[PDB]
Design a binder for this molecule. Sequence first.
Ligand SMILES: OC[C@H](O)CO[C@H]1O[C@H](CO)[C@@H](O)[C@H](O)[C@@H]1n1cc(-c2ccccc2)nn1
Ligand SMILES: [Ca+2]
Ligand SMILES: [Ca+2]
Ligand SMILES: [Ca+2]
Length: 132
Amino acid sequence: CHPCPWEWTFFQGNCYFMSNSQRNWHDSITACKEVGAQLVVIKSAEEQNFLQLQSSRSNRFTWMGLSDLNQEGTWQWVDGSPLLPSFKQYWNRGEPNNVGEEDCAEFSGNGWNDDKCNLAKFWICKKSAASC
Ligand SMILES: OC[C@H](O)CO[C@H]1O[C@H](CO)[C@@H](O)[C@H](O)[C@@H]1n1cc(-c2ccccc2)nn1
Ligand SMILES: [Ca+2]
Ligand SMILES: [Ca+2]
Ligand SMILES: [Ca+2]
């Protein structure tokens, strides 16, 4: 018994996987569902720091499970939860700026950026860990 599948990273009771290929945002959603997971929804500050550190160090622009597709300016996680004010600090300076219509969120450098949902990027999936 081990808590996460091979190649997944254990952190505080959940398992995380960063892709080695790039897809657009909607195709990334489907990729996580195909392995019984979810395009990452962030629930705590410590979790955000953990994920941001990995995107930063690897120098990979990476989708998360957050968009304002349904209502411009209203950001919502893919599990339906709203983006809380305690998370606004994580947007990069000047973001979200919707330049050329940008409705999907990514890890970019030290913070978050809104980018075009049709652009191919890396992605991170999340699923709960097994108890042993
Ligand atoms: O990971 C993304 C990477 O850091 C590059 O980020 C920049 O390009 C992204 C994609 O266009 C923007 O989403 C982002 O906001 C930022 N940008 C672009 C502009 C901008 C303003 C006026 C005209 C043209 C471009 N301002 N910021
Ligand atoms: Ca929009
Ligand atoms: Ca937008
Ligand atoms: Ca942007």
